[PDB]
Paper text:
[name] ([name]) is a key enzyme that is essential for the synthesis of purines, thymidylic acids and some amino acids. [name] catalyzes the reduction of 7,8-dihydrofolate to 5,6,7,8-tetrahydrofolate using NADPH as a cofactor and plays an influential role in folate (FOL) management in many species. The M20 loop of ecDHFR can adopt three conformations (open, closed and occluded). We determined the structure of ecDHFR in complex with FOL and NADP+ under pressures varying between 0.1 and 800 [name].
In the M20-closed crystal, the M20 loop was confirmed to be in the closed conformation from 0.1 to 400 [name]; NADP+ and FOL were also in their proper positions. The volume of the M20-closed crystal was 32 520 Å3 at atmospheric pressure and was reduced to 31 440 Å3 at 800 [name]. For the M20-closed crystal, the numbers of water molecules assigned were 87, 135, 134, 108 and 41 at 0.1, 220, 400, 650 and 800 [name], respectively.
Residue numbers in the entry: 0 to 159
Amino acid sequence: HMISLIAALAVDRVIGMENAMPWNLPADLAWFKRNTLNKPVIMGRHTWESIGRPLPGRKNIILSSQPGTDDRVTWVKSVDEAIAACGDVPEIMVIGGGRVYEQFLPKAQKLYLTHIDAEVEGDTHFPDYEPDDWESVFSEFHDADAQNSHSYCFEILERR
Ligand SMILES: NC(=O)c1ccc[n+]([C@@H]2O[C@H](COP(=O)([O-])OP(=O)(O)OC[C@H]3O[C@@H](n4cnc5c(N)ncnc54)[C@H](OP(=O)(O)O)[C@@H]3O)[C@@H](O)[C@H]2O)c1
Ligand SMILES: Nc1nc(=O)c2nc(CNc3ccc(C(=O)N[C@@H](CCC(=O)O)C(=O)O)cc3)cnc2[nH]1
């Protein structure tokens, strides 16, 4: 198979605040749906709570050391089990949050990263990643507009 991480980062690699995403960027949410639809998505229990409902058209796999509390999604207790629950698929999408990104980054072949030109009070950060290990294979910058209040750049990195 192949493991990919997808995330949106504000300044200083901030990805969250008090278990929430403090911004609204509809173009980035559309990019997220386009790149995760019809794929399995792995997330940690905190991120499941922040989303609050299953993502439709995706197999939702939740990592937690505690028993599952919702039969609409798949609960797993380890990284190995999470990967196995995905089945034989071309690409597995890991959708955070911080503690989960840390664990899957050494396994990942691709990073789908949105860089948001926004300064945000945050407590959760994307993991420190060594830039030499990665090559940029796609980059697309967008200015702010009437629907998206900050400029942003989509990037796909591939492990060298
Ligand atoms: N901007 C973005 O792209 C983005 C993406 C995702 C999330 N976020 C933000 O990230 C923040 C949450 O990230 P987080 O780091 O606090 O928590 P998280 O990584 O979402 O989930 C952490 C929890 O997942 C479970 N877990 C993780 N690894 C496990 C393992 N190997 N085995 C078993 N259980 C495991 C544990 O749950 P138990 O305690 O139940 O064992 C752990 O407490 C929120 O602010 C969210 O909004 C942002
Ligand atoms: N690039 C990126 N941006 C994000 O905002 C993001 N968020 C998470 C975790 N949080 C969330 C929060 C909401 C939705 C969500 O509502 N998505 C719906 C609607 C998409 C839309 O409205 O365009 C979905 O169907 O994917 C997804 C993930 C993980 N990876 C990300 N990756």
